[PDB]
Amino acid sequence: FLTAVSSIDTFLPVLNEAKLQWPTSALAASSEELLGGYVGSQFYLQDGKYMQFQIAGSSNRCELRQMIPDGGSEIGWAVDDGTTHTATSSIVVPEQVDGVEEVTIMQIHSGEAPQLRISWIRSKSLDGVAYEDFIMSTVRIGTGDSSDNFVKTHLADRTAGAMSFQIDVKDSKLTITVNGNVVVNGQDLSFWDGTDSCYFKAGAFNNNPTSESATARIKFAALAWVDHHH
Ligand SMILES: O=C(O)[C@H]1O[C@@H](O[C@H]2[C@H](O)[C@H](O)[C@H](O[C@H]3[C@H](O)[C@H](O)[C@H](O[C@H]4[C@H](O)[C@H](O)[C@H](O[C@H]5[C@H](O)[C@H](O)[C@H](O)O[C@@H]5C(=O)O)O[C@@H]4C(=O)O)O[C@@H]3C(=O)O)O[C@@H]2C(=O)O)[C@@H](O)[C@@H](O)[C@@H]1O
């Protein structure tokens, strides 16, 4: 068998507060199964150090979903509880194979919709400007499908090396920090006030591929989910 992610220390904290959804939103592995060596080509320890996710198919996923720690059930939190909800990661996004067009690698999601997706995308025009092979944030400020429901931002061009992300939610404001630099500062999340079902996700969620067989692949050198009280 392939080497399991839980065979080293690095990812135990997040695995203790996650379930794995694969190849759909249906459960693939509970937190205890993840901590206890769940492994396959979709989810294995790569190069002795990376938690690697792989998935093919439109809207299929191999994704961690935030859980209450220590064997608990699904978590839900609010964007304005006065704490800071923080997701940190260090991600190697390799060159994606032909047919893969957008891969969501971190999210904030609720009972109804994704508040935030951080995704790699092959090609995209944003605000009249073309970008290629880059990392994007998509924030929902509404529940509809037209442009004004979203704020989409170029976060960084994709790099060969690891790229760090920090997602902070505090007092209905979102901050995104890439390689130590604040890119998105205080994006408003007030539309979501009253929602108590938000949670973090991370991994690989395959969006709008041109081929159903093309396999997205994303490597995490680090991932953590932490609520900071103030
Ligand atoms: O490309 C465009 O045309 C526009 O796309 C806009 O972004 C899109 C994305 O491309 C994706 O389509 C994205 O997909 C969302 C999807 O709409 C749902 O919200 C889905 O929800 C699932 C949850 O992630 C979660 O896995 C949930 O799990 C439940 C479930 O009951 C399950 O059975 C289990 O037992 O318990 C779990 C639980 O843990 O809570 O299931 C949900 C499900 O219905 O399957 O999540 C995906 C997602 O992961 O984000 O939607 C966005 C969008 O914003 O609508 C945007 O880029 C726009 O600019 C483009 O024009």
UniProtKB/TrEMBL annotation:
Transmembrane region(s): none
Annotated Gene3D superfamilies: 2.60.120.200
Domain of life of the native organism: Eukaryota
GO function term, MF aspect, one: lyase activity
Stretches of the chain forming a coiled coil according to its record: none
Domain named Alginate lyase: residues: 17-223
InterPro entries hit by this protein: Alginate_lyase_2 (IPR014895), ConA-like_dom_sf (IPR013320)
Protein keywords: Lyase, Signal
Statement: the UniProt record of this protein carries the keyword Lyase: yes
Protein name: Alginate lyase
